[PDB]
Amino acid sequence: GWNAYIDNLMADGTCQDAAIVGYKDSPSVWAAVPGKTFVNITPAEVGVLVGKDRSSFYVNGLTLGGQKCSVIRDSLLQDGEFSMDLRTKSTGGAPTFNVTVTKTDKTLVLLMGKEGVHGGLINKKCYEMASHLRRSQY
Amino acid sequence: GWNAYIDNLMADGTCQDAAIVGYKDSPSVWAAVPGKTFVNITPAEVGVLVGKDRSSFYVNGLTLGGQKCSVIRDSLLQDGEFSMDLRTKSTGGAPTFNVTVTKTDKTLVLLMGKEGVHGGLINKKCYEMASHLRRSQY
């Protein structure tokens, strides 16, 4: 069902994780790549992603599936944009990955690129899916 | 309704006619743009489109909804493509249009572009609809 969307987003091999999340009323992971990070997203984290306070995550950041990230661009609630760009927080000298989350009427689409993949590539991939959903009144 | 499919194909304004025809057993136009030509397709015309003789229309031409056409590229029966491109026959000096017929498991997707619309554009639109139909086993 929703799991087929994960297959679409993972088809080209540029990303390593993806997830469709329902954020209204009772936050839930509708579909995610098994055994990865996003599969472990919590309602509390979905709360921050779409919460009213859009300034606090800039100081302490946020987590996704327990993974600390830093917000770069935040147009999640901005009409016409509905996107937020992030970057995982390097565990020391460990590699960071580009993440983009887009918002539709009923869902949140998350995407994490593989190491070195352009953040703008990951952003379009995500943005196009949100648009497909949106146009399907989802 | 099969008609919801015609609205889809007519939505961006590049085409002036579209049609979904069932070609098995007792051929019939399942859906078409009202008042145009494709609506007038007869089982006889569907017969030559899918006919086994793919050479006689290259000599005498073709007809759709009673409208004379010229075959330009026939891969209707060739897997991986299943598309055939055509051009209407100028009604005495009048402008000709590009048409593309694609074939799926049970239907024939037809599309006619407006005056001056790249035939390759008409082709892609058509080709993508048939693929959508084939994915659902239609």
Binding site: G1, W2, A4, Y5, N8, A11, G22, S26, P27, S28, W30, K106, E128, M129, H132, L133, S136, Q137, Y138 | E128, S131, H132, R135
Partner: peptide
Amino acid sequence: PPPPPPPPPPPPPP
């Protein structure tokens, strides 16, 4: 506890 997700719309071309 969340309810079951609603049925999804047809996905985009593979």
